[PDB]
Ligand SMILES: NC1CCCCCC1
């Protein structure tokens with residue numbers, strides 16, 4: 001997260017870190033045994049880490065649970081990043097509490113102008129590299145479809161939205177991939193892609209979760 005703030009320990013209780021020897025992606029806990037992330041975060045050997053703040057120190061509220069399976073969206077295209085969504089099932093159910101909690105799926109899509117919370121352990125620099133150990137947060141509005149399409153001609157599908165600031169300076173970045181965009185207590189987006197981070201007229205692009213609610217529910221119900 002570039003141009004954000006330190007969230008505070010366990011203030012984003014649905015935020016997970018995906019770890020394969022190291023943090024490589026964010027995710028969102030949607031019930032006791034399932035996490036939603038980006039399809040471009042797919043890999044084998046995933047351990048889901050819940051209750052994290054400092055991802056380099058065991059602080060006492062963590063639960064470490066290996067994934068039993070991952071399900072990438074059937075229509076995910078890794079070239080265009082259309083349908084950039086994946087479900088991860090935990091080998092055992094997480095113990096839910098104030099610091100480890102699921103985030104509700106949307107019942108309807110969020111509109112341009114809606115204020116959202118974006119979070120993750122990604123790069124905090126727009127040029128060069130610095131990775132924070134503690135969770136970073138960014139408050140950012142959803143942008144209009146027209147401004148999103150104007151920013152990224154030929155690349156924005158009906159399964160994507162832009163959020164952030166056309167002036168730059170505030171954005172998600174490398175390592176935030178797969179993490180949450182939460183608006184009015186609902187998971188509306190997944191950190192997906194962008195051209196660099198925090199660059200003028202290149203806001204972050206996010207997977208439009210409301211389009212996938214039926215798929216998520218049905219997949220969970222049979223897996
Ligand atoms: N805003 C994006 C975050 C996802 C990873 C690519 C970097 C820029």
Ligand SMILES: [Ca+2]
Nearest residue numbers: 054055057058
């Ligand atoms: Ca920790």
